[model samples]
Target chain A: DKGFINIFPMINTTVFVNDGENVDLIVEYEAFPKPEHQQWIYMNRTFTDKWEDYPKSENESNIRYVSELHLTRLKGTEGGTYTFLVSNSDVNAAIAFNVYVNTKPEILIRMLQCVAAGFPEPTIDWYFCVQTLNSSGPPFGKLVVQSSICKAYNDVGKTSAYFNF
Target chain B: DKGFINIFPMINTTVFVNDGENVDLIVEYEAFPKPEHQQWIYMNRTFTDKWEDYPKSENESNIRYVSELHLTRLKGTEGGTYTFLVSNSDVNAAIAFNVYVNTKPEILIRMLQCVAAGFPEPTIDWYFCVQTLNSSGPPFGKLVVQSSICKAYNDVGKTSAYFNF
Candidate 1:
């Protein structure tokens, strides 16, 4: 995983909007490691923030493996910019999205949010609004994501938190 | 401009700012063997955000450069996290500086501003303000600071702009 010079792997991620509306990301990444970690999918606008998570279908193993995915205007309150990040605790990988409510319709699709996790252990993280692009840049650069030496914890211990919509 | 790996050497940057007030930056860099024809130094942030000629600085002889740098509120501007990046037109080497405004007034006074430039044309001008050091961080890494070019124009045109105060 480290000291890697080049690794091009492809991953397919399909996000499920808990409310069951529309899945916006349709990407075909023909590149490495299949985006196994969190930053691959986590999309907070800035690092100082976190996202909220939701449960998925019974057969969502494939969904979990997707590294690069995008959701544009899902049919729910959790609209704006959303990013998915992975973590060891169940809640390690956080998800957040932004919303833009049309002033006239008062449509509440305004701001950013995403789901964050410490996944394997399960911890909750509630950060500010903006959804940050975990590891963004060169198509190849995005593939190079690292694990956090530190964990996100609270009084209850480890768990993930949900932030948008 | 998107897929290129800046081919310039990395340089270190140091900043001297008021504990509460924001100061402007004018950086001038020179290249070895100073390319045959005219060249420019377009300022940039960390690794992205380019600042070029217009309202900033522009073209000159075999070698001479300058850029206009401005950051709003170094204290909690983005919760006190900031960086300044520099780069030239034809060269790949770009330098960056991670700066933080501290809480203790004395600490701020000790950190002086510096640069790697030639004489006659280069002069160091430090500014100060007598205000309580803003309690910006402990939970570090919040805001980001950066700069750019067209700068000569910015120098001549920018109003309400302070160079050494």
Candidate 2:
């Protein structure tokens, strides 16, 4: 006898990890069409109550748009599950992903823009500093650089002083 | 007698899947310090000879950031794996995800603007035309309107037209 596997969609949502991070919530989904076609897709992040909509054209064909959802450091809280609502133009299926965290300077650059230009040039920088450990003899030195810049600007009249660490 | 499990430093690696419509490539990783003492994690995406820089940042204790590697619509002609290079400030790793594509297009709007202004006695004329997909599908069906007039004025005049879809 032959029967359907009824296999739940194998959605292997792999979330990258940055050390010492606090990602309190996570969710993900697979997009699909509705009505004549997909009218649109909408998602709401539970933490900020942020809503996002992706609309479809009138003459377009219905198709799927898989997505990954990330919600970190919500309410200054750590190590907790956050839920999200995902729906199609006609409110179809919804899914979620569970995220875990534990390590340092997980520098997440929220937004970086230079007007209409994208990253024309990019570079990295490092820094070193001393910190006192809870049970250490002397202050240990640690080099840390959370962010960098990449641009094509010349030194014709550079403003800020260069950084060193 | 006793036994021990060999433990090595953890590294992020890539995974790929083609579910007939689109191809998804991703990297999965975990780090030490559990969730309270996390640090920096980094990696990048590469296709053929080109590559994207390792997107990285730091995280505070007991927090997490679920980063992702995403690829869309893979038709017939574009079917191959992508190599990813994952690394940290100290260690490095490599992995791959196969990609597939048939054909697709991401739509956008292009706007054209025009204007008309006059400061005179009394003269007002506005005109608009809708470009018909079939110029032969019933006259005035696509809306073609033209009107104008000459009036005595003491100042200046201006006219403009625009097309937006």
Candidate 3:
């Protein structure tokens, strides 16, 4: 008998979204309805209430054929459970994502681009005076090589480094 | 500008076929033609030189939409170069297979079921009298678990063990 296997469909859903920066809440599924054949809705809800549709489109960031719901440019109010719902004759799979919006960096440091590699890609954050530096802002413009306290994080743990120009 | 990218079409083409056991000469292409769409010829040539057609059938084995040539029940005499050729409107890709038929194991000793796991699955062989045991005959009929010096091999190297019950 042929049977379907349900692999873990979520990654570290509790993402730390820095203030004024964007975050992408991703939900990947093992089995899914084809995007062309059926539509799967992306929905989200905060800690206080009901599910509401999350803005999504065919031209949305990183839209893929397999079940993937990308919640782009997150905000403090967007922190909560995000869901990807799909239904078909034989399967009904729902994937969820939870995000955390941290208004500031938990630590301060000194380098801009910290490099590392592993199974799940790591997130790099830069900070100045304990405030999360705007990654794309000019606060880092005047320096020769540019610097900040850089932190690389993943589910396993985090590593940080500091440098000055 | 449109340029051609040469993708190594097949997995390890160096296949070793035991004396009386069958071997499948598989040629998986990066791009291919459906069975009904194009005809691919399976050709072979021994150390003696001169290419000839190797017997293949669609009904005899699992024929896939991608190109694959299967050679069943190999003999010591059937050792040489096997080629899978295909050419389309804009893409032309050819894959080659080199087959070596080792009459018997090069080592001898005495085994049951062995276990191992890795990428390119390992090849296991048994040996006796420092000579590889006959795989297709009743030379192993007298034992409980039936034993021989076992060797597991792959591209990197080989590992071996000996046991009897």
Worst 10 residues of 2 chain A by lDDT: A113-122
lDDT of 1 by residue, A1-165 (tens): 421112222322323343324444322221122333444232334333232223223554533333334443433334345444444312233443333211100000012222222112223233552232232221111112222211233222322212222
Model 1 chain A, poorest ten-residue lDDT window?
A: A101-110
- Please give, for every candidate in the order listed, the TM-score of chain B alone compared with the true chain B: 0.33, 0.30, 0.41
Per-residue C-alpha lDDT of model 3 across residues A1-165, encoded as one tens digit per residue: 322324244367556665346654344433323322223333433222222222234654532334444455655444556655654445655556665544221222211333332213345666653222233221111111222245455564444433334
Model 2: DockQ score: 0.01
Off by over 4 Å in 1: A1-165, B1-12, B16-19, B31-62, B76-90, B104-165
TM-score of 1: 0.21
- The TM-scores of all predictions, comma-separated, are 0.21, 0.20, 0.23
DockQ of all candidates, in order? 0.01, 0.01, 0.01
> Runs in model 2 with CA error above 4 Å?
A1-16, A19-45, A49-51, A55-59, A66-77, A87-92, A104-165, B1-165
Ranking by lDDT: 3, 1, 2
Q: Taking the candidates one at a time, how many backbone clashes does each contain?
A: 92, 47, 10
Model 2 misses residue B149 by how many Å? 88
